[PDB]
Scaffold this active site. Structure first.
Site, PDB file in Angstrom:
ATOM      1  N   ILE A  25       0.826  -1.206   0.000  1.00 47.90           N
ATOM      2  CA  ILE A  25       0.000   0.000   0.000  1.00 47.90           C
ATOM      3  C   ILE A  25       0.874   1.276   0.000  1.00 47.90           C
ATOM      4  O   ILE A  25       0.394   2.379  -0.267  1.00 47.90           O
ATOM      5  CB  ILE A  25      -0.958  -0.117   1.213  1.00 47.90           C
ATOM      6  CG1 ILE A  25      -2.159  -1.020   0.891  1.00 47.90           C
ATOM      7  CG2 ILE A  25      -1.394   1.232   1.794  1.00 47.90           C
ATOM      8  CD1 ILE A  25      -2.973  -0.637  -0.337  1.00 47.90           C
ATOM      9  N   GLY A  26       2.178   1.149   0.285  1.00 45.73           N
ATOM     10  CA  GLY A  26       3.064   2.298   0.370  1.00 45.73           C
ATOM     11  C   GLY A  26       4.505   1.835   0.569  1.00 45.73           C
ATOM     12  O   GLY A  26       4.857   1.370   1.644  1.00 45.73           O
ATOM     13  N   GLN A  27       5.301   1.884  -0.505  1.00 49.04           N
ATOM     14  CA  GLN A  27       6.737   2.039  -0.364  1.00 49.04           C
ATOM     15  C   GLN A  27       6.943   3.247   0.548  1.00 49.04           C
ATOM     16  O   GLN A  27       5.976   3.688   1.181  1.00 49.04           O
ATOM     17  CB  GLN A  27       7.394   2.185  -1.734  1.00 49.04           C
ATOM     18  CG  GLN A  27       8.829   1.668  -1.772  1.00 49.04           C
ATOM     19  CD  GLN A  27       8.906   0.200  -1.428  1.00 49.04           C
ATOM     20  OE1 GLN A  27       7.917  -0.536  -1.541  1.00 49.04           O
ATOM     21  NE2 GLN A  27      10.087  -0.239  -1.024  1.00 49.04           N
ATOM     22  N   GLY A  31      10.632   1.826   5.132  1.00 51.44           N
ATOM     23  CA  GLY A  31       9.302   1.315   5.458  1.00 51.44           C
ATOM     24  C   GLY A  31       8.585   0.826   4.185  1.00 51.44           C
ATOM     25  O   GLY A  31       8.451   1.578   3.230  1.00 51.44           O
ATOM     26  N   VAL A  33       4.640  -0.328   3.672  1.00 53.82           N
ATOM     27  CA  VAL A  33       3.387  -0.356   4.413  1.00 53.82           C
ATOM     28  C   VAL A  33       2.454  -1.304   3.681  1.00 53.82           C
ATOM     29  O   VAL A  33       2.223  -1.172   2.477  1.00 53.82           O
ATOM     30  CB  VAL A  33       2.756   1.024   4.669  1.00 53.82           C
ATOM     31  CG1 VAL A  33       1.346   0.943   5.210  1.00 53.82           C
ATOM     32  CG2 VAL A  33       3.641   1.834   5.628  1.00 53.82           C
ATOM     33  N   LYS A  48       3.735  -1.542   8.901  1.00 52.44           N
ATOM     34  CA  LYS A  48       5.029  -1.016   8.446  1.00 52.44           C
ATOM     35  C   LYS A  48       6.203  -1.962   8.765  1.00 52.44           C
ATOM     36  O   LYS A  48       6.509  -2.269   9.927  1.00 52.44           O
ATOM     37  CB  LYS A  48       5.257   0.367   9.059  1.00 52.44           C
ATOM     38  CG  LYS A  48       6.433   1.130   8.423  1.00 52.44           C
ATOM     39  CD  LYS A  48       6.599   2.589   8.861  1.00 52.44           C
ATOM     40  CE  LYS A  48       6.380   2.849  10.346  1.00 52.44           C
ATOM     41  NZ  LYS A  48       7.240   3.873  10.959  1.00 52.44           N
ATOM     42  N   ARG A 137       3.627  18.831  12.492  1.00 53.60           N
ATOM     43  CA  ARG A 137       4.341  19.575  11.463  1.00 53.60           C
ATOM     44  C   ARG A 137       3.679  19.472  10.086  1.00 53.60           C
ATOM     45  O   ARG A 137       3.948  20.310   9.222  1.00 53.60           O
ATOM     46  CB  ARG A 137       5.852  19.287  11.375  1.00 53.60           C
ATOM     47  CG  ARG A 137       6.557  19.390  12.724  1.00 53.60           C
ATOM     48  CD  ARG A 137       8.011  18.999  12.458  1.00 53.60           C
ATOM     49  NE  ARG A 137       8.855  19.619  13.459  1.00 53.60           N
ATOM     50  CZ  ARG A 137       8.876  19.239  14.725  1.00 53.60           C
ATOM     51  NH1 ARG A 137       8.234  18.168  15.200  1.00 53.60           N
ATOM     52  NH2 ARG A 137       9.563  19.986  15.532  1.00 53.60           N
TER      53      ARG A 137
HETATM   54  N1  LIG Z   1      -0.337   9.663   4.850  1.00 55.27           N
HETATM   55  C1  LIG Z   1      -1.528   9.590   4.032  1.00 55.27           C
HETATM   56  C2  LIG Z   1      -2.432   8.693   4.918  1.00 55.27           C
HETATM   57  C3  LIG Z   1      -2.389   7.240   4.445  1.00 55.27           C
HETATM   58  C4  LIG Z   1      -3.062   7.224   3.050  1.00 55.27           C
HETATM   59  C5  LIG Z   1      -3.217   5.739   2.566  1.00 55.27           C
HETATM   60  N2  LIG Z   1      -4.493   5.319   1.956  1.00 55.27           N
HETATM   61  C6  LIG Z   1      -5.712   5.009   2.642  1.00 55.27           C
HETATM   62  N3  LIG Z   1      -6.848   5.055   1.967  1.00 55.27           N
HETATM   63  C7  LIG Z   1      -8.010   4.763   2.539  1.00 55.27           C
HETATM   64  C8  LIG Z   1      -8.031   4.374   3.881  1.00 55.27           C
HETATM   65  C9  LIG Z   1      -6.779   4.314   4.573  1.00 55.27           C
HETATM   66  N4  LIG Z   1      -6.711   3.931   5.996  1.00 55.27           N
HETATM   67  C10 LIG Z   1      -5.475   3.826   6.715  1.00 55.27           C
HETATM   68  N5  LIG Z   1      -5.394   3.480   8.009  1.00 55.27           N
HETATM   69  C11 LIG Z   1      -4.175   3.428   8.507  1.00 55.27           C
HETATM   70  C12 LIG Z   1      -3.217   3.760   7.540  1.00 55.27           C
HETATM   71  C13 LIG Z   1      -1.739   3.823   7.731  1.00 55.27           C
HETATM   72  F1  LIG Z   1      -1.514   3.611   9.043  1.00 55.27           F
HETATM   73  F2  LIG Z   1      -1.110   3.221   6.748  1.00 55.27           F
HETATM   74  F3  LIG Z   1      -1.367   5.038   7.422  1.00 55.27           F
HETATM   75  S1  LIG Z   1      -3.896   4.135   5.967  1.00 55.27           S
HETATM   76  N6  LIG Z   1      -5.684   4.667   3.925  1.00 55.27           N
HETATM   77  C14 LIG Z   1      -2.248   8.144   2.021  1.00 55.27           C
HETATM   78  C15 LIG Z   1      -1.214   9.196   2.542  1.00 55.27           C
END
Ligand SMILES: N[C@H]1CC[C@@H](CNc2nccc(Nc3ncc(C(F)(F)F)s3)n2)CC1
EC number: 2.7.11.1
Length: 288
Positions: A25-27, A31, A33, A48, A137
Protein backbone atom coordinates in the site's frame (compact mmCIF):
# COMPACT_ATOMS: atom_id res chain seq x y z
CA UNK A 1 24.48 -6.13 19.63
CA UNK A 2 21.16 -7.76 20.51
CA UNK A 3 19.26 -4.47 20.19
CA UNK A 4 18.12 -4.53 23.78
CA UNK A 5 14.95 -2.76 24.79
CA UNK A 6 13.27 -4.27 21.68
CA UNK A 7 11.81 -6.44 24.46
CA UNK A 8 9.66 -3.38 25.40
CA UNK A 9 7.64 -3.34 22.10
CA UNK A 10 8.02 -6.63 20.22
CA UNK A 11 5.56 -9.44 20.97
CA UNK A 12 6.56 -13.05 20.51
CA UNK A 13 5.30 -14.61 17.36
CA UNK A 14 5.42 -14.76 13.54
CA UNK A 15 3.58 -11.77 12.00
CA UNK A 16 2.98 -13.95 8.90
CA UNK A 17 0.76 -16.30 10.95
CA UNK A 18 -0.92 -13.68 13.12
CA UNK A 19 -1.73 -11.63 9.96
CA UNK A 20 -2.78 -12.85 6.45
CA UNK A 21 -3.63 -11.41 3.01
CA UNK A 22 -0.86 -8.89 3.00
CA UNK A 23 -1.09 -6.27 0.22
CA UNK A 24 1.44 -3.52 -0.45
CA UNK A 25 0.00 0.00 0.00
CA UNK A 26 3.06 2.30 0.37
CA UNK A 27 6.74 2.04 -0.36
CA UNK A 28 8.50 4.83 1.57
CA UNK A 29 11.92 6.11 2.71
CA UNK A 30 12.64 3.23 5.13
CA UNK A 31 9.30 1.31 5.46
CA UNK A 32 7.01 -0.84 3.30
CA UNK A 33 3.39 -0.36 4.41
CA UNK A 34 1.04 -3.25 3.91
CA UNK A 35 -2.57 -3.84 4.70
CA UNK A 36 -3.50 -7.20 6.16
CA UNK A 37 -6.00 -9.18 8.30
CA UNK A 38 -5.73 -10.43 11.87
CA UNK A 39 -6.35 -14.14 11.68
CA UNK A 40 -8.03 -14.13 15.11
CA UNK A 41 -10.02 -10.87 15.33
CA UNK A 42 -10.73 -10.29 11.57
CA UNK A 43 -9.63 -6.72 12.00
CA UNK A 44 -7.84 -5.00 9.17
CA UNK A 45 -4.51 -3.33 10.06
CA UNK A 46 -1.64 -1.39 8.53
CA UNK A 47 1.78 -3.00 8.89
CA UNK A 48 5.03 -1.02 8.45
CA UNK A 49 7.91 -3.42 7.74
CA UNK A 50 11.31 -2.00 8.61
CA UNK A 51 14.72 -3.28 7.78
CA UNK A 52 16.68 -2.32 10.88
CA UNK A 53 19.87 -3.44 9.04
CA UNK A 54 19.51 -0.51 6.61
CA UNK A 55 18.58 1.77 9.56
CA UNK A 56 21.51 4.16 9.60
CA UNK A 57 22.47 4.57 13.29
CA UNK A 58 18.76 5.36 13.86
CA UNK A 59 18.41 2.47 16.34
CA UNK A 60 17.16 3.71 19.75
CA UNK A 61 15.88 6.73 17.76
CA UNK A 62 13.55 4.34 15.91
CA UNK A 63 12.34 3.05 19.29
CA UNK A 64 10.23 6.20 19.25
CA UNK A 65 7.93 3.31 18.30
CA UNK A 66 7.90 3.06 22.12
CA UNK A 67 6.60 6.63 22.19
CA UNK A 68 3.91 5.48 19.73
CA UNK A 69 3.22 2.66 22.23
CA UNK A 70 2.77 5.07 25.20
CA UNK A 71 0.86 7.84 23.36
CA UNK A 72 -2.50 6.54 22.25
CA UNK A 73 -5.49 8.72 21.30
CA UNK A 74 -8.85 8.12 19.47
CA UNK A 75 -8.05 10.83 16.93
CA UNK A 76 -4.68 9.41 15.80
CA UNK A 77 -3.82 6.13 14.04
CA UNK A 78 -2.56 4.15 17.03
CA UNK A 79 0.13 1.61 17.45
CA UNK A 80 -1.39 -1.84 18.09
CA UNK A 81 1.64 -4.15 18.29
CA UNK A 82 5.04 -5.11 16.86
CA UNK A 83 6.75 -8.30 15.70
CA UNK A 84 10.35 -9.10 14.69
CA UNK A 85 11.68 -11.56 12.06
CA UNK A 86 15.50 -11.45 11.82
CA UNK A 87 16.14 -7.74 11.42
CA UNK A 88 12.68 -6.96 10.00
CA UNK A 89 10.53 -5.03 12.49
CA UNK A 90 6.83 -5.23 11.63
CA UNK A 91 4.92 -2.34 13.21
CA UNK A 92 1.18 -2.93 13.39
CA UNK A 93 -1.12 0.10 13.47
CA UNK A 94 -4.81 0.94 13.20
CA UNK A 95 -6.31 0.70 9.75
CA UNK A 96 -9.32 2.95 9.07
CA UNK A 97 -11.53 2.01 6.13
CA UNK A 98 -12.54 5.29 4.49
CA UNK A 99 -10.83 7.95 2.52
CA UNK A 100 -8.38 10.76 3.08
CA UNK A 101 -9.65 14.23 3.67
CA UNK A 102 -8.12 15.16 0.31
CA UNK A 103 -10.23 12.70 -1.64
CA UNK A 104 -13.46 14.01 -0.06
CA UNK A 105 -12.35 17.60 -0.54
CA UNK A 106 -11.75 16.91 -4.23
CA UNK A 107 -15.01 15.10 -5.02
CA UNK A 108 -17.71 16.49 -2.71
CA UNK A 109 -18.58 19.80 -1.17
CA UNK A 110 -18.69 19.95 2.63
CA UNK A 111 -20.98 22.20 4.62
CA UNK A 112 -19.81 24.32 7.57
CA UNK A 113 -21.26 21.81 10.10
CA UNK A 114 -19.26 18.95 8.65
CA UNK A 115 -16.05 21.05 8.49
CA UNK A 116 -16.78 21.92 12.15
CA UNK A 117 -16.80 18.24 13.03
CA UNK A 118 -13.48 17.53 11.26
CA UNK A 119 -11.77 20.49 12.88
CA UNK A 120 -13.12 19.47 16.29
CA UNK A 121 -11.62 15.95 15.84
CA UNK A 122 -8.28 17.33 14.54
CA UNK A 123 -8.09 19.77 17.44
CA UNK A 124 -8.64 16.97 19.98
CA UNK A 125 -5.68 15.10 18.46
CA UNK A 126 -3.59 18.24 18.41
CA UNK A 127 -4.40 19.00 22.03
CA UNK A 128 -3.14 15.52 22.90
CA UNK A 129 0.06 15.76 20.87
CA UNK A 130 0.71 19.22 22.34
CA UNK A 131 0.17 18.13 25.98
CA UNK A 132 2.81 15.45 25.25
CA UNK A 133 5.22 17.91 23.48
CA UNK A 134 4.75 16.56 19.96
CA UNK A 135 4.47 18.99 17.06
CA UNK A 136 2.97 17.19 14.09
CA UNK A 137 4.34 19.57 11.46
CA UNK A 138 2.37 18.19 8.48
CA UNK A 139 -1.29 18.82 9.27
CA UNK A 140 -2.56 18.59 5.65
CA UNK A 141 -5.59 16.98 3.86
CA UNK A 142 -3.38 14.03 2.92
CA UNK A 143 -2.76 13.08 6.58
CA UNK A 144 -6.37 12.95 7.78
CA UNK A 145 -8.30 9.68 7.49
CA UNK A 146 -12.16 9.74 7.48
CA UNK A 147 -13.66 6.49 8.57
CA UNK A 148 -16.67 4.76 7.07
CA UNK A 149 -18.24 4.91 10.54
CA UNK A 150 -17.37 8.60 11.02
CA UNK A 151 -13.92 8.35 12.63
CA UNK A 152 -11.48 11.12 11.92
CA UNK A 153 -7.79 10.42 12.56
CA UNK A 154 -4.45 12.21 12.09
CA UNK A 155 -1.58 10.30 10.50
CA UNK A 156 2.06 10.82 9.22
CA UNK A 157 3.89 12.61 12.05
CA UNK A 158 7.07 11.88 14.04
CA UNK A 159 9.41 13.85 16.38
CA UNK A 160 11.21 11.56 18.93
CA UNK A 161 11.66 17.64 6.51
CA UNK A 162 14.86 19.84 6.68
CA UNK A 163 15.96 20.75 3.10
CA UNK A 164 19.54 21.95 2.23
CA UNK A 165 19.43 25.72 1.43
CA UNK A 166 21.48 24.96 -1.74
CA UNK A 167 18.54 22.91 -3.17
CA UNK A 168 15.76 24.13 -5.49
CA UNK A 169 12.20 24.06 -4.13
CA UNK A 170 9.94 21.93 -6.34
CA UNK A 171 6.86 21.64 -4.07
CA UNK A 172 5.05 24.53 -2.38
CA UNK A 173 4.81 24.07 1.45
CA UNK A 174 1.37 25.62 1.56
CA UNK A 175 0.57 24.29 5.04
CA UNK A 176 3.55 25.88 6.81
CA UNK A 177 3.13 28.71 9.22
CA UNK A 178 5.02 32.05 8.84
CA UNK A 179 7.38 31.43 11.71
CA UNK A 180 8.30 28.14 10.05
CA UNK A 181 8.94 29.40 6.56
CA UNK A 182 11.35 32.14 7.86
CA UNK A 183 13.08 29.31 9.84
CA UNK A 184 12.60 30.86 13.26
CA UNK A 185 12.34 28.80 16.47
CA UNK A 186 8.76 27.44 16.51
CA UNK A 187 6.26 25.62 18.68
CA UNK A 188 2.94 23.74 18.68
CA UNK A 189 0.88 26.57 17.31
CA UNK A 190 2.25 25.88 13.85
CA UNK A 191 -0.11 22.92 13.81
CA UNK A 192 -2.98 25.36 14.46
CA UNK A 193 -1.78 27.44 11.51
CA UNK A 194 -1.80 24.45 9.24
CA UNK A 195 -5.28 23.37 10.44
CA UNK A 196 -6.34 26.86 9.38
CA UNK A 197 -5.03 26.21 5.93
CA UNK A 198 -6.71 22.85 5.90
CA UNK A 199 -10.10 24.46 6.83
CA UNK A 200 -9.69 26.84 3.88
CA UNK A 201 -9.08 23.81 1.70
CA UNK A 202 -12.27 22.15 2.87
CA UNK A 203 -14.21 25.29 1.78
CA UNK A 204 -12.31 26.02 -1.51
CA UNK A 205 -11.74 22.43 -2.66
CA UNK A 206 -7.99 23.12 -2.85
CA UNK A 207 -4.97 24.39 -0.88
CA UNK A 208 -3.69 27.97 -1.18
CA UNK A 209 -0.80 28.79 -3.52
CA UNK A 210 -1.55 26.08 -6.10
CA UNK A 211 -1.24 28.70 -8.88
CA UNK A 212 2.01 29.86 -7.19
CA UNK A 213 5.69 29.14 -7.74
CA UNK A 214 7.16 27.78 -4.44
CA UNK A 215 9.35 30.82 -3.73
CA UNK A 216 6.48 33.24 -4.23
CA UNK A 217 4.38 31.12 -1.90
CA UNK A 218 7.09 31.24 0.74
CA UNK A 219 7.24 35.05 0.48
CA UNK A 220 3.42 35.40 0.71
CA UNK A 221 3.31 33.07 3.73
CA UNK A 222 6.02 35.13 5.48
CA UNK A 223 4.64 38.58 4.68
CA UNK A 224 0.82 38.14 4.50
CA UNK A 225 0.18 34.74 6.08
CA UNK A 226 -3.64 34.58 6.25
CA UNK A 227 -4.08 33.42 2.55
CA UNK A 228 -7.13 35.67 1.99
CA UNK A 229 -10.41 34.20 0.85
CA UNK A 230 -11.71 34.09 -2.72
CA UNK A 231 -15.22 35.19 -1.52
CA UNK A 232 -15.42 35.93 2.24
CA UNK A 233 -19.14 36.59 2.35
CA UNK A 234 -19.70 32.93 1.36
CA UNK A 235 -18.62 31.98 4.95
CA UNK A 236 -20.56 32.54 8.17
CA UNK A 237 -18.98 35.26 10.37
CA UNK A 238 -18.35 32.65 13.06
CA UNK A 239 -16.34 30.44 10.70
CA UNK A 240 -14.22 33.38 9.49
CA UNK A 241 -13.61 34.21 13.14
CA UNK A 242 -12.44 30.66 13.74
CA UNK A 243 -10.15 30.96 10.70
CA UNK A 244 -8.78 34.24 12.01
CA UNK A 245 -7.84 32.78 15.37
CA UNK A 246 -6.04 29.86 13.70
CA UNK A 247 -4.36 32.15 11.11
CA UNK A 248 -3.12 34.91 13.38
CA UNK A 249 0.37 35.79 12.16
CA UNK A 250 1.63 36.77 15.63
CA UNK A 251 2.18 33.38 17.35
CA UNK A 252 1.16 34.69 20.79
CA UNK A 253 -2.24 35.95 19.57
CA UNK A 254 -2.94 32.76 17.54
CA UNK A 255 -5.07 30.29 19.47
CA UNK A 256 -3.94 27.16 21.24
CA UNK A 257 -5.49 23.84 20.50
CA UNK A 258 -7.14 23.91 23.96
CA UNK A 259 -8.55 27.44 23.44
CA UNK A 260 -10.00 26.55 20.10
CA UNK A 261 -11.85 23.51 21.33
CA UNK A 262 -14.07 26.03 23.10
CA UNK A 263 -14.64 28.24 20.07
CA UNK A 264 -18.27 28.78 19.06
CA UNK A 265 -17.61 27.44 15.56
CA UNK A 266 -17.31 23.82 16.78
CA UNK A 267 -20.87 24.03 18.13
CA UNK A 268 -22.07 23.87 14.53
CA UNK A 269 -20.58 20.39 14.37
CA UNK A 270 -22.91 17.76 12.90
CA UNK A 271 -22.45 14.22 14.35
CA UNK A 272 -19.62 12.28 12.76
CA UNK A 273 -21.97 9.94 10.92
CA UNK A 274 -22.61 13.01 8.67
CA UNK A 275 -19.12 12.37 7.21
CA UNK A 276 -19.93 8.92 5.93
CA UNK A 277 -21.97 10.08 2.82
CA UNK A 278 -18.93 12.23 1.96
CA UNK A 279 -16.82 9.11 1.78
CA UNK A 280 -19.26 7.06 -0.23
CA UNK A 281 -19.51 9.88 -2.79
CA UNK A 282 -15.70 10.11 -2.90
CA UNK A 283 -15.43 6.35 -3.46
CA UNK A 284 -18.08 6.55 -6.26
CA UNK A 285 -16.31 9.44 -8.01
CA UNK A 286 -12.94 7.63 -8.02
CA UNK A 287 -13.99 4.44 -9.81
CA UNK A 288 -12.27 5.89 -12.87
N1 LIG B 1 -0.34 9.66 4.85
C1 LIG B 1 -1.53 9.59 4.03
C2 LIG B 1 -2.43 8.69 4.92
C3 LIG B 1 -2.39 7.24 4.45
C4 LIG B 1 -3.06 7.22 3.05
C5 LIG B 1 -3.22 5.74 2.57
N2 LIG B 1 -4.49 5.32 1.96
C6 LIG B 1 -5.71 5.01 2.64
N3 LIG B 1 -6.85 5.06 1.97
C7 LIG B 1 -8.01 4.76 2.54
C8 LIG B 1 -8.03 4.37 3.88
C9 LIG B 1 -6.78 4.31 4.57
N4 LIG B 1 -6.71 3.93 6.00
C10 LIG B 1 -5.47 3.83 6.72
N5 LIG B 1 -5.39 3.48 8.01
C11 LIG B 1 -4.18 3.43 8.51
C12 LIG B 1 -3.22 3.76 7.54
C13 LIG B 1 -1.74 3.82 7.73
F1 LIG B 1 -1.51 3.61 9.04
F2 LIG B 1 -1.11 3.22 6.75
F3 LIG B 1 -1.37 5.04 7.42
S1 LIG B 1 -3.90 4.14 5.97
N6 LIG B 1 -5.68 4.67 3.93
C14 LIG B 1 -2.25 8.14 2.02
C15 LIG B 1 -1.21 9.20 2.54
Amino acid sequence: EIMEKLRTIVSIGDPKKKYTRYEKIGQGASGTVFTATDVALGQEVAIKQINLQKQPKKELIINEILVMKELKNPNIVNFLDSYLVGDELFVVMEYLAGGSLTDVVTETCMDEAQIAAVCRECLQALEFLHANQVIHRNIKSDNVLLGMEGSVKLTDFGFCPEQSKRSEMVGTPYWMAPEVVTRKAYGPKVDIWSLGIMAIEMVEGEPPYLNENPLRALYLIATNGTPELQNPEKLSPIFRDFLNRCLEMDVEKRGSAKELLQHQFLKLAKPLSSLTPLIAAAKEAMKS
